[PDB]
């Protein structure tokens, strides 16, 4: 085992090597500061000047919103306004995609949904539902659906402006009339159904049935031609 022994001794020499210097990281590098330093750092880094820094910080936030504790500390640190502001940027579509996904991760827990509602995030998602991109629409539908799990979000959707559920159903009918994209329509219709199950649904039903004239549209969308989840 002479070769093994010389390899071991040579490795031990290479271990205690007196490395020269920790050369400085580039500007576009993100990292987690020890312990709590990361959550304040993120909400700063979400509002930096360079775009790629903001995108990679969006990815880091999507990493940081998984555990409930990190969710609480990140939403208390003031993450939601930054994420919604980045969502409303229309210059680059990718950032909108990642922001919508990040909001979907954010809205899972109760505090995330309440703070999304308070900071006018539901309006931002409703506006983003008409984004000419494609993936961001699916992400926004998923985020709205996951936010609508709570009754308070359902009520906030009921009365936010004049018409929110009405143009949602209108968009579902519009996208089913032109083309055959069924995922977006099914997501929108299940979101509408989750709205109808709000405890006081008198406003939610009245709006839909009266103004939107939903019943003939659903009767037309019940035909056996359409994909089965749409019929469901």
């Amino acid at each position: 085992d002479s070769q093994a022994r010389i390899q071991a001794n040579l490795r031990h020499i290479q271990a205690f090597e007196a490395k020269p210097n920790p050369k400085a990281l580039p500007e576009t590098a993100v990292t987690r500061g020890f312990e709590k330093v990361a959550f304040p750092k993120l909400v700063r880094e979400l509002t930096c000047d360079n775009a790629v820094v903001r995108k990679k910080s969006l990815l880091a936030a999507r990493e940081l919103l998984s555990s409930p504790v990190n969710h609480v500390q990140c939403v208390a640190a003031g993450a939601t306004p930054a994420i919604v502001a980045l969502l409303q940027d229309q210059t680059d579509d990718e950032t909108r995609y990642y922001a919508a996904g990040t909001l979907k991760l954010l809205a899972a827990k109760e505090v995330g949904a309440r703070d999304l509602a308070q900071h006018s995030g539901l309006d931002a998602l409703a506006a983003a539902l008409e984004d000419p991109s494609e993936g961001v629409r699916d992400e926004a539908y998923g985020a709205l659906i996951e936010a609508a799990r709570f009754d308070s979000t359902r009520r906030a959707l009921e009365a936010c402006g004049s018409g929110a559920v009405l143009p949602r159903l209108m968009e579902l009918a519009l996208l089913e009339a032109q083309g055959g994209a069924a995922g977006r329509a099914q997501q929108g219709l299940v979101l509408l159904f989750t709205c109808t199950q709000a405890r006081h649904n008198a406003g939610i039903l009245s709006q839909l049935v009266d103004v939107a004239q939903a019943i003939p549209h659903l009767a037309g969308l019940l035909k056996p031609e359409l994909p089965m989840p749409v019929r469901h």
Binding site: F16, E17, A18
Partner: protein
């Protein structure tokens, strides 16, 4: 004319088992103390 040996100084870092990001490879050895003087 005599002979003397030289060597530079060398440094090491130790990092403990961290509850977070860390997984350390085990390449260590064990020993029993015995008496001391």
């Amino acid at each position: 004319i005599k002979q003397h040996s030289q060597q530079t100084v060398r440094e090491q870092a130790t990092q403990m088992a961290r509850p977070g990001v860390l997984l350390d490879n085990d390449y260590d050895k064990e020993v029993t103390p015995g008496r001391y003087q």
